[PDB]
């Protein structure tokens, strides 16, 4: 329940992704959990909302994260790679241009188990999650943000 960034683990044990606890809601990417319930201590977190097209899912309540990249400023990926301490990587996002508008994108390539790691603005707010993207042979992740 405590606010923070979390590893998402499966069972030996393997890290399949990352997510964000904020305001009592756990936020991660659909492709990480496929909506499955999650254990947290002796408690269980049940899915509340999800959407395959956005590649997002929330647990215990509705999606709470609503900050957005300002289009000009550097951001930080708070990467939580498997087997490694949470670390911040600063970058200037590029842009995914789509028929429905532009999306920030980060040209950073971390292990798959890093999917769900939060991208932060200078104020410390989560502007989206890392791990849904495209290849150009370097991977580029959208900054994926839901709707509050």
């Amino acid at each position: 329940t405590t606010d923070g960034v979390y590893r998402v683990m499966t069972r030996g044990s393997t890290q399949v992704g990352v997510g964000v606890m904020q305001e009592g809601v756990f936020h991660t990417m659909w492709h990480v959990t496929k909506g499955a319930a999650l254990r947290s201590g002796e408690g269980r977190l049940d899915p509340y909302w999800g959407d395959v097209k956005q590649d997002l899912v929330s647990y215990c309540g509705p999606w709470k994260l609503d900050a957005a990249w300002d289009g000009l400023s550097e951001v930080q990926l708070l990467a939580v790679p498997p087997g490694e301490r949470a670390k911040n990587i600063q970058t200037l996002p590029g842009i995914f241009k789509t028929k429905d508008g532009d999306i920030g994108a980060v040209a950073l390539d971390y292990p798959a188990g890093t999917s769900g790691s939060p991208i932060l603005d200078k104020s410390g707010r989560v502007i989206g999650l890392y791990g849904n993207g495209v290849v150009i042979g370097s991977y580029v992740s959208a900054i994926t943000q839901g709707k509050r």
Partner: protein, 40 residues
């Protein structure tokens, strides 16, 4: 299959962060399965 979560840190900006990566501008489409693809 037991899926479980472990806290790994606070959500905080770090003043001493490594800085890397480019800023490409790409045309993409997003399909119904949530898959991004490049467009030309």
């Amino acid at each position: 299959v037991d899926m479980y979560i472990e806290r790994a840190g606070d959500i905080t900006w770090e003043k001493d962060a490594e800085v890397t990566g480019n800023s490409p501008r790409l045309d993409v489409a997003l399909d119904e399965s949530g898959d991004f693809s490049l467009v030309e």
